[PDB]
Amino acid sequence: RDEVIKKKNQNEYYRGRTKKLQATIISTKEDFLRSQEILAQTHLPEKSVF
Amino acid sequence: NQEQAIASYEAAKEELGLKIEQIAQEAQPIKEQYDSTKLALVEAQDELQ
Amino acid sequence: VKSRFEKEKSNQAEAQSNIDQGRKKVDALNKTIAHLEEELTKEMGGDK
Amino acid sequence: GYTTRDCPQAACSQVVSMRDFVRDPIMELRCKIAKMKESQEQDKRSSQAIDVL
């Protein structure tokens, strides 16, 4: 019984970690939206500089 | 940046190590008091029977 | 108190495994930056 | 506030005291089972939101 209640506590901690991962993927989606401005090589390098 | 991240991770790891050392040196009195109060009254139930 | 100790030691072991994964990552990155330094020496960067 | 107070619900005109009430564990069992089911469905919804994102 002690083992199963401690593993339930560990599962609750894993759910909290999953919520933290949800926050992190939200932040990464925000970073994706930010890079959507200049992400696809908007500043093309010079062709014949050499 | 991953180097500074792993450095912060090592700092958190040593902080957690100090914390677990503290809670280990602090929980032993609680455990010994628990087992002492348990064994002292089990014999009480035995002598009651 | 034993649940506190167990959760603390479990997240400590998790941090230790994360430190091991970070060591793997930093040695892989050392290998890749050595490869990039070889590429730079071939392209005559810091060499010049 | 009153030494003899009837139940708020109808169909029972008799007064109910403190000794008349009994602790029925089935009710709290059902409430906590419903709470556990709600937490489980919330966890399922969060996991599905994780998958679709």
XYZ file of N, CA, C and O in Angstrom:
800
model
N 0.827 -1.201 0.000
C 0.000 0.000 0.000
C 0.864 1.255 0.000
O 0.583 2.214 -0.731
N 1.920 1.264 0.817
C 2.873 2.368 0.773
C 3.487 2.503 -0.615
O 3.650 3.617 -1.128
N 3.815 1.374 -1.245
C 4.407 1.405 -2.578
C 3.444 2.004 -3.596
O 3.833 2.844 -4.417
N 2.175 1.589 -3.559
C 1.235 2.083 -4.560
C 0.901 3.551 -4.320
O 0.719 4.310 -5.278
N 0.850 3.998 -3.062
C 0.561 5.413 -2.836
C 1.764 6.274 -3.212
O 1.607 7.381 -3.744
N 2.983 5.772 -2.988
C 4.153 6.530 -3.417
C 4.270 6.556 -4.937
O 4.704 7.564 -5.507
N 3.849 5.487 -5.616
C 3.864 5.511 -7.074
C 2.751 6.394 -7.625
O 2.910 6.992 -8.692
N 1.634 6.521 -6.902
C 0.615 7.489 -7.297
C 1.125 8.916 -7.128
O 0.852 9.785 -7.965
N 1.869 9.174 -6.050
C 2.511 10.477 -5.895
C 3.500 10.738 -7.025
O 3.571 11.854 -7.556
N 4.270 9.717 -7.408
C 5.199 9.865 -8.525
C 4.457 10.134 -9.829
O 4.926 10.904 -10.673
N 3.292 9.508 -10.012
C 2.489 9.769 -11.202
C 1.950 11.195 -11.202
O 1.865 11.834 -12.256
N 1.580 11.710 -10.029
C 1.159 13.106 -9.941
C 2.314 14.047 -10.271
O 2.125 15.068 -10.946
N 3.520 13.714 -9.808
C 4.689 14.517 -10.157
C 4.969 14.453 -11.654
O 5.377 15.448 -12.263
N 4.748 13.288 -12.264
C 4.907 13.166 -13.709
C 3.855 13.975 -14.457
O 4.145 14.532 -15.518
N 2.637 14.055 -13.920
C 1.620 14.913 -14.522
C 2.012 16.384 -14.420
O 1.796 17.161 -15.360
N 2.581 16.785 -13.283
C 3.106 18.138 -13.171
C 4.221 18.409 -14.166
O 4.289 19.486 -14.765
N 5.109 17.431 -14.354
C 6.158 17.564 -15.361
C 5.566 17.655 -16.762
O 6.096 18.363 -17.624
N 4.463 16.947 -17.006
C 3.791 17.038 -18.298
C 3.187 18.421 -18.506
O 3.204 18.953 -19.620
N 2.648 19.020 -17.442
C 2.159 20.393 -17.543
C 3.303 21.364 -17.817
O 3.156 22.317 -18.595
N 4.454 21.137 -17.180
C 5.633 21.946 -17.478
C 6.053 21.787 -18.936
O 6.430 22.763 -19.595
N 5.989 20.559 -19.455
C 6.303 20.324 -20.860
C 5.301 21.024 -21.769
O 5.660 21.505 -22.848
N 4.037 21.084 -21.349
C 3.034 21.831 -22.101
C 3.381 23.313 -22.148
O 3.279 23.954 -23.201
N 3.804 23.873 -21.014
C 4.248 25.265 -21.005
C 5.447 25.468 -21.927
O 5.524 26.468 -22.655
N 6.387 24.520 -21.919
C 7.568 24.654 -22.767
C 7.206 24.575 -24.246
O 7.769 25.309 -25.065
N 6.270 23.696 -24.612
C 5.889 23.616 -26.019
C 5.079 24.841 -26.423
O 5.125 25.261 -27.584
N 4.352 25.455 -25.485
C 3.726 26.743 -25.781
C 4.788 27.795 -26.076
O 4.665 28.577 -27.029
N 5.848 27.832 -25.264
C 6.919 28.796 -25.508
C 7.602 28.534 -26.847
O 7.968 29.475 -27.563
N 7.773 27.262 -27.210
C 8.395 26.951 -28.494
C 7.479 27.297 -29.662
O 7.962 27.701 -30.723
N 6.163 27.156 -29.492
C 5.237 27.614 -30.523
C 5.296 29.129 -30.671
O 5.208 29.658 -31.788
N 5.442 29.845 -29.554
C 5.643 31.288 -29.623
C 6.930 31.626 -30.368
O 6.968 32.569 -31.168
N 7.995 30.861 -30.121
C 9.246 31.075 -30.844
C 9.080 30.788 -32.333
O 9.677 31.468 -33.175
N 8.276 29.779 -32.673
C 7.975 29.504 -34.076
C 7.250 30.680 -34.716
O 7.581 31.095 -35.832
N 6.251 31.225 -34.018
C 5.529 32.383 -34.536
C 6.454 33.585 -34.689
O 6.291 34.392 -35.613
N 7.430 33.720 -33.790
C 8.390 34.817 -33.898
C 9.303 34.637 -35.105
O 9.547 35.592 -35.853
N 9.817 33.423 -35.310
C 10.676 33.154 -36.458
C 9.906 33.173 -37.771
O 10.523 33.263 -38.840
N 8.576 33.075 -37.719
C 7.780 33.184 -38.936
C 7.958 34.532 -39.625
O 7.666 34.646 -40.820
N 8.431 35.550 -38.904
C 8.696 36.842 -39.528
C 9.890 36.756 -40.471
O 9.764 36.998 -41.677
N 11.061 36.411 -39.939
C 12.266 36.203 -40.741
C 12.823 34.834 -40.357
O 13.659 34.711 -39.455
N 12.361 33.794 -41.043
C 12.852 32.435 -40.850
C 13.325 31.768 -42.131
O 14.344 31.072 -42.116
N 12.623 31.967 -43.242
C 12.912 31.248 -44.484
C 13.951 31.973 -45.334
O 13.735 32.246 -46.514
N 15.098 32.276 -44.725
C 16.208 32.956 -45.390
C 15.739 34.251 -46.053
O 15.852 34.447 -47.265
N 15.197 35.145 -45.223
C 14.741 36.435 -45.729
C 15.909 37.309 -46.165
O 15.754 38.151 -47.056
N 17.077 37.125 -45.554
C 18.287 37.861 -45.916
C 19.166 36.921 -46.733
O 20.045 36.241 -46.202
N 18.920 36.883 -48.036
C 19.685 36.008 -48.915
C 21.107 36.535 -49.063
O 21.297 37.739 -49.278
N 22.124 35.684 -48.949
C 23.502 36.153 -49.118
C 23.760 36.631 -50.538
O 23.048 36.286 -51.484
N 24.801 37.447 -50.675
C 25.142 38.013 -51.971
C 25.595 36.914 -52.924
O 26.245 35.945 -52.521
N 25.246 37.070 -54.202
C 25.511 36.021 -55.182
C 26.959 36.053 -55.655
O 27.687 35.060 -55.539
N 27.398 37.189 -56.191
C 28.687 37.303 -56.867
C 29.646 38.227 -56.122
O 30.349 39.037 -56.729
N 29.685 38.116 -54.793
C 30.598 38.945 -54.012
C 32.032 38.449 -54.162
O 32.983 39.242 -54.145
N 32.213 37.137 -54.333
C 33.559 36.582 -54.443
C 34.240 37.028 -55.732
O 35.401 37.451 -55.712
N 25.370 27.900 -25.047
C 24.105 28.008 -24.324
C 23.736 26.686 -23.661
O 23.248 26.673 -22.525
N 23.988 25.556 -24.329
C 23.760 24.282 -23.656
C 24.769 24.059 -22.535
O 24.460 23.371 -21.557
N 25.957 24.661 -22.634
C 26.933 24.569 -21.553
C 26.458 25.327 -20.320
O 26.536 24.817 -19.197
N 25.966 26.554 -20.505
C 25.426 27.276 -19.355
C 24.167 26.599 -18.820
O 23.922 26.616 -17.606
N 23.383 25.964 -19.697
C 22.219 25.211 -19.241
C 22.633 24.032 -18.367
O 22.052 23.800 -17.302
N 23.646 23.276 -18.799
C 24.078 22.124 -18.013
C 24.794 22.580 -16.746
O 24.792 21.868 -15.736
N 25.382 23.779 -16.755
C 25.964 24.321 -15.531
C 24.877 24.664 -14.518
O 25.002 24.357 -13.325
N 23.802 25.309 -14.977
C 22.660 25.550 -14.098
C 22.057 24.236 -13.616
O 21.596 24.134 -12.472
N 22.059 23.214 -14.475
C 21.560 21.903 -14.075
C 22.430 21.288 -12.986
O 21.915 20.680 -12.045
N 23.752 21.436 -13.097
C 24.647 20.931 -12.059
C 24.462 21.695 -10.754
O 24.541 21.110 -9.666
N 24.223 23.006 -10.843
C 23.942 23.788 -9.642
C 22.663 23.308 -8.967
O 22.615 23.132 -7.743
N 21.610 23.087 -9.757
C 20.378 22.537 -9.206
C 20.598 21.147 -8.625
O 19.999 20.799 -7.603
N 21.463 20.347 -9.252
C 21.725 18.999 -8.761
C 22.432 19.026 -7.412
O 22.077 18.264 -6.507
N 23.430 19.897 -7.252
C 24.105 19.978 -5.959
C 23.204 20.598 -4.896
O 23.276 20.208 -3.722
N 22.335 21.537 -5.283
C 21.352 22.053 -4.336
C 20.408 20.952 -3.870
O 20.120 20.830 -2.673
N 19.923 20.130 -4.805
C 19.060 19.011 -4.444
C 19.801 17.979 -3.603
O 19.200 17.352 -2.728
N 21.098 17.792 -3.850
C 21.875 16.895 -3.011
C 21.993 17.396 -1.585
O 21.836 16.629 -0.630
N 22.269 18.692 -1.418
C 22.277 19.271 -0.079
C 20.910 19.138 0.582
O 20.813 18.845 1.781
N 19.838 19.328 -0.192
C 18.492 19.220 0.362
C 18.184 17.798 0.816
O 17.605 17.596 1.891
N 18.552 16.797 0.012
C 18.278 15.419 0.404
C 19.153 15.015 1.582
O 18.716 14.251 2.448
N 20.380 15.540 1.663
C 21.201 15.291 2.845
C 20.554 15.880 4.092
O 20.535 15.243 5.154
N 20.012 17.095 3.980
C 19.348 17.723 5.118
C 18.124 16.925 5.552
O 17.934 16.653 6.743
N 17.278 16.536 4.594
C 16.071 15.798 4.952
C 16.388 14.379 5.408
O 15.572 13.760 6.098
N 17.555 13.842 5.044
C 17.950 12.533 5.548
C 18.474 12.626 6.975
O 18.145 11.781 7.814
N 19.285 13.644 7.266
C 19.741 13.851 8.635
C 18.640 14.382 9.543
O 18.815 14.382 10.766
N 17.518 14.833 8.981
C 16.397 15.322 9.774
C 15.291 14.292 9.962
O 14.555 14.369 10.951
N 15.149 13.335 9.041
C 14.071 12.359 9.149
C 14.424 11.206 10.080
O 13.521 10.536 10.593
N 15.714 10.957 10.303
C 16.113 9.870 11.194
C 15.578 10.025 12.614
O 15.129 9.014 13.183
N 15.601 11.209 13.245
C 14.941 11.326 14.557
C 13.460 10.997 14.510
O 12.944 10.346 15.427
N 12.763 11.419 13.453
C 11.341 11.110 13.331
C 11.128 9.605 13.233
O 10.247 9.044 13.893
N 11.942 8.927 12.419
C 11.792 7.484 12.254
C 12.099 6.739 13.548
O 11.384 5.794 13.911
N 13.161 7.140 14.253
C 13.502 6.450 15.492
C 12.447 6.694 16.564
O 12.095 5.775 17.312
N 11.905 7.915 16.636
C 10.815 8.177 17.570
C 9.588 7.345 17.222
O 8.924 6.803 18.113
N 9.280 7.225 15.928
C 8.136 6.423 15.506
C 8.299 4.969 15.928
O 7.396 4.384 16.536
N 9.447 4.365 15.610
C 9.617 2.953 15.937
C 9.712 2.731 17.442
O 9.258 1.694 17.940
N 10.274 3.691 18.184
C 10.325 3.561 19.635
C 8.931 3.628 20.245
O 8.601 2.839 21.138
N 8.098 4.561 19.777
C 6.730 4.637 20.278
C 5.902 3.441 19.827
O 4.926 3.078 20.494
N 6.270 2.821 18.705
C 5.540 1.648 18.238
C 5.881 0.419 19.074
O 4.985 -0.292 19.542
N 7.176 0.157 19.278
C 7.571 -1.032 20.027
C 7.216 -0.917 21.504
O 6.963 -1.935 22.159
N 7.191 0.303 22.047
C 6.915 0.481 23.467
C 5.459 0.206 23.820
O 5.165 -0.100 24.980
N 4.544 0.311 22.857
C 3.131 0.080 23.124
C 2.614 -1.236 22.560
O 1.512 -1.657 22.929
N 3.369 -1.891 21.677
C 3.014 -3.248 21.272
C 3.160 -4.199 22.453
O 2.285 -5.037 22.714
N 4.264 -4.076 23.194
C 4.411 -4.842 24.427
C 3.348 -4.453 25.444
O 2.959 -5.276 26.280
N 2.857 -3.212 25.383
C 1.746 -2.821 26.242
C 0.488 -3.605 25.897
O -0.222 -4.077 26.791
N 0.201 -3.773 24.604
C -0.941 -4.592 24.208
C -0.731 -6.050 24.597
O -1.679 -6.740 24.995
N 0.508 -6.536 24.495
C 0.798 -7.913 24.883
C 0.542 -8.130 26.371
O -0.114 -9.100 26.768
N 1.047 -7.225 27.214
C 0.813 -7.357 28.647
C -0.647 -7.107 29.000
O -1.141 -7.650 29.993
N -1.359 -6.313 28.195
C -2.794 -6.148 28.399
C -3.532 -7.456 28.149
O -4.410 -7.845 28.929
N -3.188 -8.150 27.063
C -3.771 -9.466 26.818
C -3.392 -10.445 27.925
O -4.205 -11.286 28.332
N 7.081 11.796 5.697
C 8.508 12.094 5.610
C 9.201 11.138 4.644
O 10.113 11.534 3.907
N 8.758 9.878 4.592
C 9.364 8.935 3.662
C 8.942 9.218 2.227
O 9.728 8.999 1.304
N 7.730 9.738 2.018
C 7.330 10.149 0.678
C 8.120 11.367 0.227
O 8.506 11.466 -0.943
N 8.374 12.304 1.143
C 9.235 13.438 0.822
C 10.637 12.967 0.453
O 11.212 13.410 -0.549
N 11.200 12.056 1.251
C 12.532 11.536 0.955
C 12.555 10.800 -0.379
O 13.509 10.935 -1.155
N 11.507 10.026 -0.670
C 11.458 9.269 -1.915
C 11.341 10.191 -3.121
O 12.039 9.997 -4.121
N 10.468 11.200 -3.051
C 10.348 12.129 -4.169
C 11.633 12.925 -4.359
O 12.051 13.177 -5.498
N 12.301 13.288 -3.260
C 13.550 14.030 -3.374
C 14.644 13.177 -4.002
O 15.351 13.636 -4.905
N 14.789 11.925 -3.559
C 15.811 11.068 -4.151
C 15.475 10.708 -5.593
O 16.385 10.547 -6.414
N 14.187 10.621 -5.938
C 13.825 10.308 -7.315
C 14.124 11.478 -8.243
O 14.665 11.280 -9.336
N 13.792 12.706 -7.831
C 14.144 13.839 -8.682
C 15.649 14.084 -8.684
O 16.187 14.603 -9.667
N 16.354 13.678 -7.622
C 17.812 13.741 -7.645
C 18.390 12.764 -8.662
O 19.304 13.113 -9.417
N 17.871 11.533 -8.697
C 18.305 10.578 -9.711
C 17.929 11.044 -11.112
O 18.677 10.807 -12.068
N 16.783 11.711 -11.252
C 16.406 12.275 -12.544
C 17.384 13.361 -12.972
O 17.786 13.421 -14.141
N 17.782 14.227 -12.038
C 18.776 15.247 -12.347
C 20.119 14.620 -12.694
O 20.843 15.123 -13.558
N 20.467 13.510 -12.038
C 21.715 12.823 -12.359
C 21.675 12.226 -13.762
O 22.657 12.312 -14.511
N 20.548 11.616 -14.134
C 20.405 11.098 -15.492
C 20.433 12.229 -16.513
O 20.981 12.074 -17.611
N 19.853 13.380 -16.164
C 19.917 14.535 -17.051
C 21.345 15.044 -17.189
O 21.751 15.485 -18.267
N 22.128 14.975 -16.111
C 23.530 15.378 -16.178
C 24.316 14.413 -17.057
O 25.203 14.823 -17.816
N 23.998 13.119 -16.981
C 24.650 12.148 -17.855
C 24.299 12.396 -19.320
O 25.173 12.342 -20.197
N 23.021 12.660 -19.603
C 22.617 12.997 -20.964
C 23.294 14.275 -21.437
O 23.677 14.392 -22.607
N 23.464 15.245 -20.537
C 24.167 16.462 -20.898
C 25.636 16.222 -21.183
O 26.216 16.861 -22.058
N 26.256 15.297 -20.448
C 27.640 14.933 -20.741
C 27.749 14.269 -22.108
O 28.682 14.545 -22.875
N 26.800 13.386 -22.427
C 26.747 12.811 -23.768
C 26.623 13.907 -24.823
O 27.328 13.896 -25.843
N 25.738 14.874 -24.578
C 25.534 15.960 -25.529
C 26.793 16.804 -25.690
O 27.138 17.201 -26.807
N 27.499 17.082 -24.591
C 28.668 17.950 -24.694
C 29.828 17.222 -25.359
O 30.624 17.847 -26.065
N 29.945 15.901 -25.187
C 31.009 15.208 -25.911
C 30.678 15.092 -27.396
O 31.566 15.226 -28.250
N 29.401 14.866 -27.730
C 29.004 14.889 -29.135
C 29.254 16.261 -29.754
O 29.703 16.366 -30.903
N 28.984 17.326 -28.997
C 29.226 18.671 -29.502
C 30.715 18.972 -29.603
O 31.132 19.705 -30.501
N 31.529 18.418 -28.702
C 32.976 18.535 -28.851
C 33.439 17.871 -30.139
O 34.268 18.425 -30.872
N 32.900 16.688 -30.440
C 33.235 16.019 -31.695
C 32.826 16.865 -32.898
O 33.597 17.026 -33.854
N 31.615 17.429 -32.862
C 31.144 18.181 -34.022
C 31.878 19.513 -34.173
O 32.101 19.966 -35.301
N 32.306 20.134 -33.070
C 33.069 21.370 -33.208
C 34.507 21.070 -33.610
O 35.150 21.895 -34.261
N 35.031 19.891 -33.264
C 36.316 19.482 -33.822
C 36.211 19.277 -35.328
O 37.107 19.679 -36.083
N 35.117 18.661 -35.782
C 34.887 18.529 -37.218
C 34.767 19.895 -37.888
O 35.305 20.114 -38.980
N 34.070 20.832 -37.240
C 33.930 22.171 -37.808
C 35.255 22.924 -37.815
O 35.512 23.709 -38.731
N 36.110 22.697 -36.816
C 37.432 23.311 -36.820
C 38.301 22.724 -37.924
O 39.092 23.441 -38.548
N 38.168 21.420 -38.179
C 38.840 20.825 -39.331
C 38.352 21.455 -40.631
O 39.153 21.765 -41.523
N 37.038 21.661 -40.749
C 36.491 22.310 -41.937
C 37.014 23.734 -42.081
O 37.302 24.189 -43.193
N 37.147 24.453 -40.965
C 37.665 25.818 -41.016
C 39.136 25.838 -41.416
O 39.565 26.707 -42.183
N 39.926 24.891 -40.905
C 41.325 24.814 -41.309
C 41.458 24.436 -42.778
O 42.416 24.851 -43.439
N 40.512 23.656 -43.304
C 40.521 23.340 -44.727
C 40.067 24.522 -45.577
O 40.541 24.689 -46.706
N 39.165 25.351 -45.053
C 38.662 26.521 -45.761
C 39.523 27.760 -45.548
O 39.218 28.812 -46.123
N 40.571 27.661 -44.729
C 41.540 28.738 -44.517
C 40.873 29.959 -43.871
O 40.803 31.052 -44.434
N 40.384 29.726 -42.656
C 39.787 30.764 -41.839
C 40.751 31.269 -40.784
O 41.569 32.157 -41.051
N 40.637 30.733 -39.566
C 41.610 31.044 -38.533
C 43.042 30.789 -38.960
O 43.969 31.423 -38.450
N 43.243 29.873 -39.912
C 44.578 29.648 -40.458
C 45.145 30.929 -41.061
O 46.246 31.359 -40.706
N 44.397 31.561 -41.970
C 44.846 32.829 -42.535
C 44.820 33.946 -41.500
O 45.650 34.863 -41.552
N -28.584 27.356 16.128
C -29.509 28.457 16.238
C -30.889 28.067 16.726
O -31.612 28.922 17.250
N -31.269 26.800 16.568
C -32.555 26.298 17.028
C -32.371 24.886 17.565
O -31.687 24.065 16.948
N -32.982 24.612 18.719
C -32.846 23.293 19.327
C -33.626 22.232 18.557
O -33.291 21.045 18.632
N -34.658 22.635 17.818
C -35.457 21.711 17.017
C -35.695 22.352 15.658
O -36.542 23.242 15.529
N -34.953 21.904 14.649
C -35.066 22.430 13.295
C -35.295 21.280 12.329
O -34.549 20.296 12.343
N -36.323 21.407 11.494
C -36.640 20.377 10.519
C -35.680 20.449 9.333
O -34.878 21.377 9.197
N -35.772 19.446 8.464
C -34.920 19.401 7.290
C -35.368 20.446 6.268
O -36.560 20.750 6.159
N -34.429 21.019 5.511
C -34.817 22.013 4.497
C -35.693 21.440 3.397
O -36.524 22.167 2.839
N -35.532 20.162 3.067
C -36.335 19.543 2.027
C -37.751 19.272 2.531
O -38.033 19.302 3.733
N -38.649 19.002 1.590
C -40.047 18.753 1.901
C -40.271 17.256 2.116
O -39.324 16.473 2.230
N -41.539 16.853 2.193
C -41.978 15.469 2.361
C -41.510 14.847 3.672
O -41.678 13.638 3.872
N -40.927 15.638 4.575
C -40.486 15.155 5.889
C -40.810 16.248 6.905
O -40.021 17.173 7.113
N -41.980 16.134 7.536
C -42.397 17.112 8.533
C -41.778 16.858 9.900
O -41.817 17.748 10.757
N -41.213 15.675 10.123
C -40.603 15.365 11.408
C -39.283 16.110 11.571
O -38.557 16.358 10.604
N -38.975 16.466 12.814
C -37.740 17.175 13.121
C -36.579 16.189 13.132
O -36.732 15.009 13.471
N -35.404 16.670 12.734
C -34.191 15.863 12.674
C -33.150 16.496 13.585
O -32.849 17.689 13.458
N -32.604 15.700 14.500
C -31.597 16.160 15.439
C -30.211 15.711 14.982
O -30.034 15.139 13.903
N -29.210 15.980 15.823
C -27.843 15.591 15.492
C -27.660 14.081 15.578
O -26.949 13.489 14.757
N -28.292 13.440 16.564
C -28.164 11.996 16.717
C -28.895 11.228 15.623
O -28.590 10.052 15.403
N -29.849 11.862 14.938
C -30.569 11.175 13.872
C -29.704 11.001 12.631
O -29.870 10.021 11.895
N -28.785 11.929 12.381
C -27.912 11.827 11.220
C -26.891 10.714 11.416
O -26.356 10.521 12.512
N -26.620 9.978 10.340
C -25.646 8.896 10.351
C -24.646 9.131 9.229
O -24.958 9.757 8.211
N -23.432 8.622 9.423
C -22.351 8.789 8.456
C -22.438 7.672 7.423
O -22.050 6.531 7.696
N -22.948 8.000 6.235
C -23.046 7.037 5.151
C -21.829 7.177 4.252
O -21.729 8.170 3.514
N -20.886 6.230 4.270
C -19.674 6.380 3.450
C -19.913 6.212 1.959
O -19.032 6.574 1.170
N -21.068 5.684 1.547
C -21.327 5.475 0.125
C -21.400 6.810 -0.607
O -20.923 6.942 -1.742
N -21.978 7.826 0.037
C -22.119 9.128 -0.607
C -20.758 9.760 -0.877
O -20.468 10.178 -2.004
N -19.908 9.842 0.151
C -18.575 10.400 -0.046
C -17.742 9.536 -0.984
O -16.917 10.063 -1.738
N -17.949 8.216 -0.957
C -17.309 7.340 -1.933
C -17.664 7.758 -3.352
O -16.786 7.898 -4.211
N -18.956 7.973 -3.613
C -19.389 8.360 -4.951
C -18.852 9.734 -5.334
O -18.434 9.944 -6.479
N -18.847 10.682 -4.392
C -18.331 12.014 -4.704
C -16.842 11.975 -5.034
O -16.397 12.610 -5.999
N -16.054 11.229 -4.256
C -14.623 11.173 -4.539
C -14.332 10.357 -5.793
O -13.361 10.645 -6.500
N -15.171 9.369 -6.110
C -15.011 8.648 -7.369
C -15.308 9.566 -8.547
O -14.612 9.532 -9.569
N -16.332 10.414 -8.421
C -16.622 11.383 -9.472
C -15.490 12.393 -9.619
O -15.139 12.784 -10.738
N -14.905 12.825 -8.498
C -13.764 13.734 -8.565
C -12.570 13.071 -9.243
O -11.868 13.702 -10.044
N -12.327 11.794 -8.936
C -11.239 11.068 -9.584
C -11.493 10.920 -11.079
O -10.568 11.049 -11.889
N -12.745 10.658 -11.464
C -13.080 10.561 -12.881
C -12.892 11.899 -13.586
O -12.430 11.943 -14.732
N -13.245 12.998 -12.917
C -13.039 14.318 -13.503
C -11.556 14.618 -13.681
O -11.143 15.147 -14.720
N -10.737 14.284 -12.680
C -9.297 14.484 -12.817
C -8.727 13.618 -13.935
O -7.851 14.060 -14.688
N -9.223 12.385 -14.066
C -8.751 11.504 -15.130
C -9.126 12.043 -16.504
O -8.310 12.011 -17.431
N -10.353 12.546 -16.657
C -10.754 13.097 -17.948
C -10.010 14.392 -18.254
O -9.713 14.669 -19.422
N -9.667 15.177 -17.229
C -8.850 16.365 -17.460
C -7.442 15.984 -17.900
O -6.875 16.611 -18.805
N -6.864 14.955 -17.275
C -5.558 14.467 -17.704
C -5.614 13.937 -19.132
O -4.685 14.149 -19.920
N -6.704 13.252 -19.484
C -6.862 12.751 -20.845
C -6.961 13.896 -21.845
O -6.361 13.842 -22.925
N -7.717 14.943 -21.502
C -7.824 16.099 -22.385
C -6.476 16.790 -22.555
O -6.119 17.208 -23.664
N -5.710 16.916 -21.468
C -4.392 17.537 -21.572
C -3.451 16.695 -22.426
O -2.690 17.235 -23.237
N -3.495 15.369 -22.270
C -2.653 14.509 -23.096
C -3.048 14.599 -24.565
O -2.182 14.615 -25.445
N -4.351 14.664 -24.850
C -4.796 14.812 -26.232
C -4.347 16.147 -26.815
O -3.949 16.219 -27.984
N -4.407 17.215 -26.013
C -3.882 18.502 -26.455
C -2.382 18.428 -26.709
O -1.867 19.110 -27.603
N -1.670 17.612 -25.932
C -0.251 17.385 -26.188
C -0.055 16.691 -27.531
O 0.820 17.066 -28.321
N -0.868 15.668 -27.810
C -0.714 14.933 -29.064
C -1.014 15.814 -30.272
O -0.260 15.804 -31.252
N -2.105 16.583 -30.229
C -2.484 17.384 -31.390
C -1.575 18.583 -31.602
O -1.674 19.245 -32.642
N -0.696 18.882 -30.652
C 0.219 20.011 -30.784
C 1.665 19.536 -30.897
O 2.550 20.290 -31.301
